[PDB]
Design a protein around this nucleic acid. Structure first.
Ligand code: ZN
Length: 127
DNA sequence: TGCAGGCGCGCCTGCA
DNA sequence: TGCAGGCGCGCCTGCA
């Protein structure tokens, strides 16, 4: 997919042949989800292209669990995309704190969850 | 063209 | 309660 190629140019880090193919499938699962909503893909690309410039929420439906499954692998969606485009070494959701600018941060128990990586800041995980 | 096979969501179990 | 992983219906789409 050509959209997956433009977003994968923003991917951080150096992953192996298996993990590069997994992030490609994770980005594809997200593109397939944001294509139904008008302006969602454009907002994500803008947020990724201009890091230090304000961006709107880019959300997907919240599962009861909080997990998103991509190629039989389970994980929280906002952690997945924050790892792809910002912090490859992100250990867990405990290392993310939402910005006041985000309406749908993870943990807000709303119908939608924001996956815009620049709507979270990286923090040290507590004891 | 269409439906079969692939695989995610949502249920569960098991520690902790 | 949180979190990891098994399982199978049901939605989807790729290739027969
Ligand atoms: Zn947001």
């Amino acid at each position: 997919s050509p959209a997956v190629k433009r977003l994968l140019g923003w991917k951080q880090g150096e992953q192996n042949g298996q993990e590069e193919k997994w992030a490609e499938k994770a980005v594809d699962a997200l593109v397939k989800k944001l294509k139904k909503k008008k302006g969602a893909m454009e907002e994500l690309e803008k947020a990724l292209s201009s890091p230090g410039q304000p961006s709107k929420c880019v959300t997907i439906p919240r599962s009861l669990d909080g997990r998103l499954q991509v190629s039989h692998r389970k994980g929280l969606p906002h952690v997945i995309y924050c790892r792809v485009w910002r912090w490859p070494d992100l250990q867990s959701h405990h290392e993310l704190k939402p910005l006041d600018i985000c309406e749908f941060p993870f943990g807000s128990k709303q119908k939608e969850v924001c996956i815009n990586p620049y709507h979270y800041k990286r923090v040290e995980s507590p004891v």
